[PDB]
Design a protein around this nucleic acid. Structure first.
Ligand SMILES: [Mg+2]
Ligand SMILES: [Mg+2]
Ligand SMILES: [Zn+2]
Lengths: 206, 184, 129, 87, 150, 81
RNA sequence: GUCGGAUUUCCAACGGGGCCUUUCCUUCUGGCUAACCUUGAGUCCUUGUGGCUCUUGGCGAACCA
């Protein structure tokens, strides 16, 4: 139910490997073992980035399918994710929560931060735990960026990457947004690479 | 010697196979010395849905030991002669009926004579010389059993063109279905 | 020790269904487990199951849908007169409409409604719903 | 659920979970529905056609939601070579 | 899971699914029967015999190559011992412990363990006793036993 | 894990299970054809041999038994089966 | 169909019985039916070893002791 187009492109893969999204953490939850490709002699695991890709395409189809492009929420309290997410919001028009996720932002209609998503995307399912926990109280689907040691509780469609290094983060977010826009029609053809650099998504401090 | 090889019943196929038998020992010194003491009881012909048939050969049990030392060449020659027929060698094992609740006097009917043992022997002979590595009954959602036999990888080619034949033969002799499969 | 096989079989199946798994690996197997499962299947409480030979006593792999609220074994296989069935079904099953207290009679193993129909009775194995 | 006149008589036939075939009930605020987008040859997703799944709150709490989604999608044409039937 | 102790270890010979011979084996049945009797005459117990054939003479299973069990092979040729062999070894053990006890009367643990062994002897005994592989009157006593092993 | 195949497990994960806890238990031991050059005769020796096997003729010890496996002597030809 | 119930054909259901599948009650000797023939006879209609009953000896399936 997807064309010979959507398959992983040599260029894409180059990007990924350049940003070491393939570098998985030292321990594997029994829940993410199928993602793990092989383990290196130093104890660092390798992720089937083909699967990283297909999960990206999936998360994209979902982010796409939501009627009002405002409802989708990107989240991150994680430093790097702040920067990346903000842009994600910009190009995709989704709503962003960088930094401190106020508790009860999904319950409690009285507070000013009250939002009623129809999909949450989260950078780190551990540091952003509460947003996941809270999404669970109100039928809100979570799509996360999980390392191989990230709690896969209350998440559907995990994207196996590398929550640690900023390159991996930014890259994944960017690829995500790009795929979404390719799905909407915003970036007409599929041969055309994104005019925008992934480095816009990277975390920079002066 | 077509009446010499059989045991008290001459039919067309049986006389033709006994005659082929003779003409096959007539062209050898060791094969003739081995095949001559080898008698066989009866023969049965049963069809496959490929357009051809199969020749099951009933053998007295205490002779099968010797029959197995020759069976590859013997079936080779008997298949080169009798063409469009898949030749199979089975033993003759008498099954005893299960003791009824009012069964009068019966000696403790041994397990070798049990319906189970016998059918699992028919399986065993059906695929000589390849060796059965494990069986597996499927219980369907329609209430049909399917016995799945698994075979080795040493003599695949000797039997590969015969699988379907078994599925007929067995079905004619046991009433049970069967499927064959080989370990990846 | 392993005193009833049927007991551990049905226990495994139940636990698995609660976890929401999709397959279980029963061991060992029995003519009885086989029959019990065939009856479970006839009413579609489980999908299809496979018996694995190993010369000892086989294992079984059962696939299950999710239609199984609880199956269990009633333990000392009490005898049951025909009129008595009504009381068992009045206790175990959640409803007069459905469910099955499955028996062992001299006319084979079967659910209780088949026992009603064939007009026989025997001992009581367990119960499905 | 019918009566004798052959007419249905429930409040509602409820949503079953897709992974688990168990019922999702009305107070289960951890249950979820997933719309995935049907796509064109041009790689555009149509605004109003979805392949949708249901998931019990149980499966998401237990942390099997993901793997469940994988299998489901893969079998329903969305993915390929993500989810193995063997492990 | 282990009478007379708390431990629950599983450890045993598995067995091949194959009921019949291995391909790579090329000796006759009479060969190994001859070998077996030859070893029994040397004085061995069925166990040690099978171990020898498994080790040196590459016989996987006695009952495979020869359709008979090792014990049946010995009984066929009149080499069956009067008492079955595991029982033999149990009694042997209890004799040993009882002797060490005669010297040491203060080893409580030895007294204890002697009791356990004796119990196993008793249970085993009654089994053999029932299936008539031991004479219905046969009985273990300490003096009797020391007379048996000596 | 919520769904899987048990009748057809991966041979990888299967060869790592304990001897008994597989889909059908079967030994993990094998047999060895061996030769000491000073005899030119193949003996067959069980991989986890418990008795130290001597060659047919010469009083030479092919292998000493240890815990789990058999420790074959230095400078000895062997081959599986 | 019929002058409220009626039974045949079409059809599933659901139970029961007896067989054929290597395979269920086994006989032994004396009495009683019909069936196979030996055998010449009789009544009918297609010119009949066709159908229905006889006269001595048995095969097989029920039957009683
Ligand atoms: Mg134990
Ligand atoms: Mg005790
Ligand atoms: Zn030597």
């Amino acid at each position: 139910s997807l064309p010979a187009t959507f398959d992983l492109t040599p260029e894409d893969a180059q990007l990924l490997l350049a940003a070491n999204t393939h570098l998985g953490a030292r321990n594997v939850q029994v829940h993410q073992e199928p993602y793990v490709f092989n383990a290196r002699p130093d104890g660092v695991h390798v992720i089937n980035v083909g699967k990283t890709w297909e999960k990206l395409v999936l998360a994209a189809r979902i982010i796409a399918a939501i009627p009002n492009p405002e409802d989708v929420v990107a989240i991150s309290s994680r430093t790097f994710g702040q920067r990346a997410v903000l842009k994600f919001a910009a190009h995709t028009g989704a709503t962003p929560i960088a930094g401190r996720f106020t508790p009860g932002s999904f319950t409690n209609y009285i507070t000013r931060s009250f939002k009623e998503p129809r999909l949450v995307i989260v950078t780190d399912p551990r540091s952003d735990a509460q947003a996941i926990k809270e999404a669970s109280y109100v039928n809100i689907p979570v799509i996360a960026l999980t390392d191989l040691d990230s709690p896969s509780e209350f998440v559907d469609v995990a994207i196996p990457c590398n929550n640690r290094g900023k390159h991996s983060i930014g890259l994944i977010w960017y690829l995500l947004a790009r795929e979404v826009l390719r799905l909407r029609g915003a970036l007409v053809d599929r041969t055309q690479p994104w005019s925008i650099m992934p480095d816009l998504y990277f975390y920079r401090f002066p | 010697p077509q009446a010499k090889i059989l045991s008290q019943a001459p039919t067309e196929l049986e006389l033709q196979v006994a005659q082929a038998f003779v003409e096959l020992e007539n062209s050898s010194p060791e094969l003739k010395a081995e095949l001559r003491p080898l008698q066989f009881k009866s023969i049965r012909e049963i069809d496959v849905a490929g357009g051809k048939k199969a020749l099951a050969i009933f053998v007295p049990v205490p002779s099968l030991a010797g029959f197995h030392k020759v069976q590859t060449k013997l079936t080779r020659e008997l298949e080169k002669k009798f063409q469009d027929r898949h030749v199979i060698f089975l033993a003759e094992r008498r099954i005893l009926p299960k003791p009824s609740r009012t069964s009068r006097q019966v000696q403790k009917r041994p397990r070798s004579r049990t319906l189970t043992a016998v059918h699992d022997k028919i399986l065993e002979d059906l695929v000589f010389p390849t060796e059965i590595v494990g069986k597996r009954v499927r219980y369907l959602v329609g209430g049909n059993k399917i016995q799945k036999v698994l075979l080795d990888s040493k003599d695949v080619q000797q039997i590969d063109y015969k699988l379907e034949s078994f599925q007929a033969v067995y079905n004619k002799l046991t009433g049970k279905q069967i499927v064959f499969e080989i370990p990846s | 020790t392993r005193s009833s096989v049927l007991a551990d079989a049905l226990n495994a199946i139940n636990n698995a269904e609660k976890t929401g798994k999709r397959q279980v690996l029963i061991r060992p197997s029995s003519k009885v487990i086989i029959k019990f499962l065939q009856v479970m299947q006839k009413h579609g409480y489980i999908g299809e199951f496979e018996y694995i030979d190993d010369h000892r006593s086989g294992k079984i792999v059962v696939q299950l849908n999710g239609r199984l609220n609880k199956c269990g074994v009633i333990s000392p296989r009490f005898n049951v007169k025909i009129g008595d069935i009504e009381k068992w079904t009045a206790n175990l099953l959640p409803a007069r409409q459905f469910g099955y207290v499955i028996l062992t009679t001299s006319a084979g193993i079967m659910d209780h409604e088949e026992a009603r129909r064939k007009h026989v009775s025997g001992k009581i194995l367990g119960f499905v719903y | 659920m019918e009566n004798d006149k052959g007419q249905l008589v429930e409040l509602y036939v409820p949503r079953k979970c897709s992974a688990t075939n168990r019922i999702i009930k009305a107070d289960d605020h951890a249950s979820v529905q997933i719309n995935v987008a049907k796509v064109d040859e041009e790689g555009r997703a149509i605004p109003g056609e979805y392949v949708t799944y249901a998931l019990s709150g149980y499966v998401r709490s237990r942390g099997e939601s993901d793997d469940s989604l994988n299998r489901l999608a893969q079998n329903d044409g969305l993915l390929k070579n993500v989810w193995s039937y063997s492990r | 899971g282990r009478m007379h102790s708390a431990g629950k270890g599983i450890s045993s010979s598995a067995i091949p699914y194959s009921r019949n011979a291995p391909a790579w084996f090329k000796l006759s049945s009479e060969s190994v029967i001859e070998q077996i009797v030859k070893y029994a005459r040397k004085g061995l117990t069925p166990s040690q015999i099978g171990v020898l054939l498994r080790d040196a003479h590459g016989v996987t299973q006695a009952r495979v190559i020869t359709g008979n069990k090792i014990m049946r092979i010995l009984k066929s040729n009149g080499l069956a011992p009067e008492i079955p062999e595991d029982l033999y070894y149990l009694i042997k053990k209890a004799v040993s412990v009882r002797k060490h006890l005669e010297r040491n009367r203060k080893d409580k643990d030895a007294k204890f363990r002697l009791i356990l062994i004796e119990s196993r002897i008793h249970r085993l005994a009654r089994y053999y006793r029932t299936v008539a592989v031991l004479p219905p009157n046969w009985k273990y006593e300490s003096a009797t036993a020391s007379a048996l092993v000596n | 894990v919520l769904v899987q195949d048990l009748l057809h497990p991966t041979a990888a994960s299967e060869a790592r299970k304990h001897k008994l806890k597989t889909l059908v238990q079967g030994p993990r031991s094998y047999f060895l054809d061996v030769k000491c050059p000073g005899c030119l005769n193949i003996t067959t020796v069980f991989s986890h041999a418990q008795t130290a096997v001597t060659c047919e003729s010469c009083s030479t010890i092919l292998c000493t038994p240890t815990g789990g496996k058999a420790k074959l002597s230095e400078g000895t030809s062997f081959r599986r089966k």
